[PDB]
Amino acid sequence: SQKARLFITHLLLLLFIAAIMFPLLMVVAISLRQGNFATGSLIPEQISWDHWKLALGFSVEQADGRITPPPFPVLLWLWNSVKVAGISAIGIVALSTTCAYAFARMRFPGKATLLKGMLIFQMFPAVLSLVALYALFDRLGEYIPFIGLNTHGGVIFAYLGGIALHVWTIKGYFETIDSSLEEAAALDGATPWQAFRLVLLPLSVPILAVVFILSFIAAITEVPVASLLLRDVNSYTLAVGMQQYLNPQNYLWGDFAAAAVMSALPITIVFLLAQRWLVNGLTAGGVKG
Amino acid sequence: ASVQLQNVTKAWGEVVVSKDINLDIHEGEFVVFVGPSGCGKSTLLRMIAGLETITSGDLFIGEKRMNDTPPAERGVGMVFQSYALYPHLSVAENMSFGLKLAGAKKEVINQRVNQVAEVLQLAHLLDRKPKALSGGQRQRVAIGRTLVAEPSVFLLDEPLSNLDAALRVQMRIEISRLHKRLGRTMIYVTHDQVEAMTLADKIVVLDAGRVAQVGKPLELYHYPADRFVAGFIGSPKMNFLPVKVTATAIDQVQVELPMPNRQQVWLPVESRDVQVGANMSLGIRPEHLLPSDIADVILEGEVQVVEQLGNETQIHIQIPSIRQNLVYRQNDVVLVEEGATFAIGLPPERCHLFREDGTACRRLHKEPGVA
Amino acid sequence: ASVQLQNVTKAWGEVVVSKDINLDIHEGEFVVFVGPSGCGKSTLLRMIAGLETITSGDLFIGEKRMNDTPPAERGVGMVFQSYALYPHLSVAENMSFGLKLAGAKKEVINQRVNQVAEVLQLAHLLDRKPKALSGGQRQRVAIGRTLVAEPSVFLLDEPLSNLDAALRVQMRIEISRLHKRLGRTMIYVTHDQVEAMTLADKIVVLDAGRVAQVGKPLELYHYPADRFVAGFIGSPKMNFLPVKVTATAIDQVQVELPMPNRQQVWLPVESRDVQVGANMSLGIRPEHLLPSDIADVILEGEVQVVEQLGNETQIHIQIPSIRQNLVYRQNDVVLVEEGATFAIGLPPERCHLFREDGTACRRLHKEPGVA
Amino acid sequence: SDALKWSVLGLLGLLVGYLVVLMYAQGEYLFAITTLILSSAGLYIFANRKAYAWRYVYPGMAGMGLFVLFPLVCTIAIAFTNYSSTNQLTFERAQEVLLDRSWQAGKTYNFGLYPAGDEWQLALSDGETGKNYLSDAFKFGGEQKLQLKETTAQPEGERANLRVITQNRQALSDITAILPDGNKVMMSSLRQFSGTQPLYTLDGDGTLTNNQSGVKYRPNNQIGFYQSINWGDEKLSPGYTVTTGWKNFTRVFTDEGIQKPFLAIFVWTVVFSLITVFLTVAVGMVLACLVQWEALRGKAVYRVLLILPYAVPSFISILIFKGLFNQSFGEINMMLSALFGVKPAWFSDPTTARTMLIIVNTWLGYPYMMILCMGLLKAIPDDLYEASAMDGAGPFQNFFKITLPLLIKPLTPLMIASFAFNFNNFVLIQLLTNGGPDRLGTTTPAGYTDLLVNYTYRIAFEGGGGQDFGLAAAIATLIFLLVGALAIVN
Amino acid sequence: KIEEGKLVIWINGDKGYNGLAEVGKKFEKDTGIKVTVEHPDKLEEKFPQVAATGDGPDIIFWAHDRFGGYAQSGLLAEITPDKAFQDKLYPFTWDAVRYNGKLIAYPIAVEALSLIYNKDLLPNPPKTWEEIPALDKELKAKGKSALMFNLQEPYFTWPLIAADGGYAFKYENGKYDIKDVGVDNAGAKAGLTFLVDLIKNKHMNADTDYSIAEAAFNKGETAMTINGPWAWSNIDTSKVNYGVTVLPTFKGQPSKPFVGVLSAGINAASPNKELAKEFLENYLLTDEGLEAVNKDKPLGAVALKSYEEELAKDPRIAATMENAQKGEIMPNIPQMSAFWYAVRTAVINAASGRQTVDEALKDAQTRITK
């Protein structure tokens, strides 16, 4: 019977992957089609490498014979995205983990209220959020310019406030870990910091990966806030940079699609690297019961 | 440090698992807690270590009121009933964890981890993680972790329960030597009567959240204060059978056995609040029943069960006008069949007697080995 | 249903945890696995259950090969060493879990859950979660969950280890009552010698992966095949003194004790392949040593440890020229103390004798109860 | 490091206070007060050891205050004002804008700058009479008046170029030139002097009076405009922001036209969100379970492929779906017509459009739920499944009796959050269906796929009254009170 | 607060911003004033946010329709080009940049839709919409079609709808009457009825969108399409031998595409208005200046007469200008946002058979006016 389920699973997964990959293959197709066209065959009739050439830093020899150098530094935009998403992801993990630990293991007044509040206030549709943020970062810039307008620090600093859900997520996971491990830690003389760092985090490593992954993705794909704070072309992230390809009456689809595909590269890599922390059985053998 | 509990009460809402508990564990005392599974032995340990809150009353360690002190600051170590091993760390790392938090020399950590590991017979398992150990090995890891820490107050919660007999004996001894070397307070919870009898300076018997009795091992065995303690200390348990008081003296009680023949026996037991005609419970241990040939007071009946333990034979006998069977122990292997008629002797010096309320009429026969 | 292992082996990489195991457990047979904490009992039980793969060899259940079969389709149930309770479910729901999966007859579930909860003394704990339970209560919830399911084969891994001596007796008896009513194969792991002696149709002594010996309780007690089994079955363990073969007769071996008097005694054991001047180990149980005044062969020495168990007194004696203390058991409370001089009788017919490799020369003295 | 703590605490509490007083300068008071309480709370927390717990919470809370709560409050605050593209400036900036307005009050002369040694001469040319005028030698510096003289001759100096005119534009702009007939003229461009003058002059009490018409205007702080004068019926542009009490909040309850489709739009948004959350959780959880199955041999590859819909920005993906779903063209209906002989009306028919929307959202949303479940599944101990096998469990029984129940608890807050997000998933509807097809009869227009936010956005930002930020903020706060109430009960 | 003695310019990223920067270098050489050109994302939305506080660029370049909004908000300076300067640009482009009757930006370029056709399939394109049904029929015999354009977006279908009397908001003389809307008049119905008939007779399909229409023309599947100057380079790379000409007439009257006029506004908060005037009037709006921008990225038809006459030697640019002049200037009032949605829906309703042409246009009239 176990052979029957496995083959069926393989069959249904492949069919399911085929379906969900189809839209993405059409994006890849757009990026290899000559000119800028949103529709066409899966394998484009007229193939072109120019969209990728320009995206990768290559100049292009076009019909009339003159050389077209790359209008934009796409790879630099990609690096900027990795930097902003990477540093902000670390910051978010570090901030929400410590928060979670308190909520999950410590007594203090208005704790239930704070968690209700964190959840509820992040649900607010702040339609005028950009107006508020611009004003904050404009003033902040006069005093700490390292985190003001037109800085990566600023973009990163802005993302560090999006932790409420991550705090709930990590909290919940901490609560699956039997507390006697930390109790025994305490009796061995461990401070709450030491029990947190040396006992709990090592066993919580799967959810730390989840939070890093979710935060990286969020940051790599973010437009409005980065677009609002970043001014200089050489500081743009990729998500902001590729907005240059969109105009009121037409889109440079080919260039935009190639940018969209490049943006999936750092995410795929981080997802792969994150798997070493996604392991079962971390608590096995600790607690009888 | 000394440990004292003054009117300690513990309630999980309306359920009360500790009632006005008063104990006084002196400096360097080895105290064993025994009692039925579910009675509150672990709860007492957890309240002392600071892992469970105290509903009311006062806990003192080394003369300091510790009710609100954090666990890390009580001078307490514990071998958890559930072991509570660090599953991400090896045996060595489990055993050396506490010493690393204190900034101990690496050589000092390796010296005394190897020392504890050798006696526990875990030396070849130092690299293993808890998941890759047997149930009894895990337990020994939990023992060795607390041994290395050498706290001022040792709590052991059923620390030998998953070990072979031969090894249990070897661990009994090491714990006993440790207490003699360090002279520090040890509070040891066990269901094993031999551990209790050989380790304890003093045994605390619990019963549904109350302290039923406290005393030296031989004190509880020979002189249980009531029926419950009498039925709990010593296994196979003491036999009980209803009797009727026929006459009294200041230092003895005459009772009529329930058999058709109404045999009367004087017991060397007090007659305080013991009235003629009252229904009592006569306790006699399986080990204390004698062969029939060398006996005055005879009880005869039909054999119901025979357990051959090799060293001895335990024989359960059904005796007319007594609902419960009589359990008898005899040295060596004895060939008996179910249904056979068996007689045993009932020695009056070694009979306990319990009032309607369950309280013991104190025995006045003097047993060698108790003050 | 029947269970059978043929040349069954287990290896974690290149570390043989079970070495070529042959067992033929018949339908309705109560088999008990014993052996040192870490010898491979749970590994065996799990390999039978399907929770662990078999490196090589053949496992059969109900005359059907199960090696590659999923544990759920093997007709077994298990009381886990570490309980492995469902934390999200109550006691009732834990206990009823297997029955719901198979065919939820609501009346039948409630009825059988109430009945099993009664004998286990869990009836007042039905709506608790595992976390709101004692150690021994959890253990009993694990027992209840397997017993409610009534599988064709019961597997129990140290299932009474955390229960009080008195409750333990009541569970021994109930597991016996259940075995005789259902008549199903039960395989039962334990470190308790009484449980092994009283429950087992057959006892399997395991030692570092291998089967040391298989037999009836009294067979293993009276006639152990080797030094290991001799030292494992029986607790306190069999004493061991080195000797030399002096002269040999057609059907009994003569040896010499190492102590200064150099006394020579004839042991009724098999002579087949035993040479003069070979260093043997002579074995005598603490229960079998006699009072000095009676017997012929006397060993005298200094008392080192006295353990007062109430029912008996256990006395460790250091004899000159011997290095291991001689453990002696005597009934009742014996007033003796560390330092005193104590001698004992060594009965020839109960002395075991083991070759240099550790194998026993078959004892020819007939002991009772081994038909 | 023992006495190091209080010096580090002191050194940081020195930067704080320094930064606060430095903010008290210029006049950033909201910023100086807010920066002070926040720092003090933090310094207090790390100073005394009875606030230990708050040390873990404060850094995360602080960030949340700045970048979630502050924007939240501003939005709420703006709800009580007419802030819009019509009334976008502060009163000060509006007045300032009005005071820069000019009108041409006379003649216009091309000018030239000519050196006379180390001094200068200004020439003006009147194109409409052919007359030219030239000043005497002057030096640059401050407000000076130059009498010009009609002339037939040329200046002796070489005409100054644009570079020189520019360098000296400030001084040049302070010159008041006087023609022979007594007409004032001043610099209006880099090439010209003219009679340009202010359109309005500020009184002192606050009355703006138009120099060209003589009409008088005063600030009307009810509607946020300078209005003529007792109030006349003319309003100057630009208007300015002003408080409007409850106005934006009432209009939502006042107007019966905007209320007609509300309930039907509300039910669809709820149903859209519920189904999205259910399907993303179900699909994601099941996939997470499969891709950790020890027996599945390609799981490492499947795992990565399955999250790729989330690796690509959703913008291009949605627009591509729009193409794939085209009723006549587009590859899905071409597949459906060749196989099953049908072409679903994915844009024209309401129910089919909604099905499409949910299909695409599930594609968008499952990876999120999958990744969460990938981590959460690791919290379930393996021996629970050893016990379940000994109880007779199969894989489907394991899923429903053990896996699902142990995951629903940690998932609950995440699902509630996902419901709120999807409740306001403005962008998906805009790009894919634009809210269509049309609900016929809707005075203010609505379609069958519109979420509340889409309809609302249209009223606030389209609908012909410019961008009404006040109204948007007010609505956003109302729909918050609604979904905040739906989340607290759920 | 904007920096004095410099010029910051914002222009969209699909214009010749490198060209405009070279014009900026000349200005610098002649004046000492540095000119910085930026092309941020969503500059049309960022401008009103930074300008309202008194910051932002000195000069903004965008389509004129948005400048009515900025002007009303108080963010644009009133410009002062004299009689002579105004005569250098087409009079109708000045109409595109008035707010309350006053000029508020300099027209730069002119954009409108033209008829684009395949020379190889259709050497002589039709002068009339009425010629199209018959022409599609002889093309369908060769497995092709006559006309495929975007029917989803009213920007593309308005030219035909407006021809016979349809209009957005009536323009009096620098004042759009906001309650005089011409979407449900006879002219609009006739235009929209003819469009629906093309669909009914299967000469076109109701859910032909931009991408499908563009792909169909670029691959040679259709003889004609309707599109703007931004579409030309895709066709260049397709190598389809194509022409661009005047849109077909409906009932003898010209198709009236919407006109978009790239315009340069001066920031009301700029301390450098005079510098901006000189740069705009004497440097950019010259043959030399516009050529520098065009050379970088083509501007299409331009508002400067002198340079338009040189560009119109390309018949494609001449065609753009011709269609623009017969077209309707895009109104620069806020009420247009209602127009777009209401009309988009009404065409969808008619093309898909969800409503009649009459009802669909009636309801669209009603939604705009009240």
Ligand SMILES: CCCCCC/C=C\CCCCCCCCCC(=O)O[C@H](COC(=O)CCCCCCCCCCCCCCC)COP(=O)(O)OC[C@@H](O)CO
């Ligand atoms: C509407 C939902 C649509 C889902 C679309 C998914 C698209 C991909 C196609 C996959 C189709 C499923 C086919 C299943 C085939 C059998 C799989 C199998 O047989 O493999 C099982 C994998 O389990 C597992 O993912 C669990 C097996 C799946 C259980 C089926 C549940 C489907 C219903 C979902 C409802 C979710 C609940 C609502 C949430 C709010 C093996 O598990 P076991 O080893 O027994 O135990 C667990 C181990 O940890 C034990 O150590």
Ligand SMILES: CCCCCCCCCCCO[C@@H]1O[C@H](CO)[C@@H](O[C@H]2O[C@H](CO)[C@@H](O)[C@H](O)[C@H]2O)[C@H](O)[C@H]1O
């Ligand atoms: C989905 C991912 C798709 C990946 C994209 C494809 C990878 C990029 C193509 C690899 C480079 O391919 C191409 O190489 C040629 C020379 O060999 C380059 O040509 C250029 O450099 C050569 C010298 O090296 C010159 O002689 C030539 O005039 C110039 O055009 C061209 O600019 C580059 O673009």
Ligand SMILES: Nc1ncnc2c1ncn2[C@@H]1O[C@H](COP(=O)(O)OP(=O)(O)NP(=O)(O)O)[C@@H](O)[C@H]1O
């Ligand atoms: N994953 C593993 N890798 C290597 N060795 C292991 C692993 N798991 C268990 N062992 C060893 O295998 C041996 C047998 O284990 P097990 O079968 O649990 O013993 P047991 O007889 O049940 N002991 P106990 O439970 O203490 O009475 C022990 O020596 C273990 O340390």
Ligand SMILES: Nc1ncnc2c1ncn2[C@@H]1O[C@H](COP(=O)(O)OP(=O)(O)NP(=O)(O)O)[C@@H](O)[C@H]1O
């Ligand atoms: N969280 C809880 N809520 C309610 N009751 C509890 C809780 N924890 C334990 N109990 C009960 O409190 C009593 C004492 O528990 P415990 O102290 O573990 O007993 P114990 O004597 O250690 N039993 P054992 O370990 O089986 O020998 C038992 O009846 C438990 O069922």
Ligand SMILES: [Mg+2]
């Ligand atoms: Mg306990």
Ligand SMILES: [Mg+2]
């Ligand atoms: Mg085991």
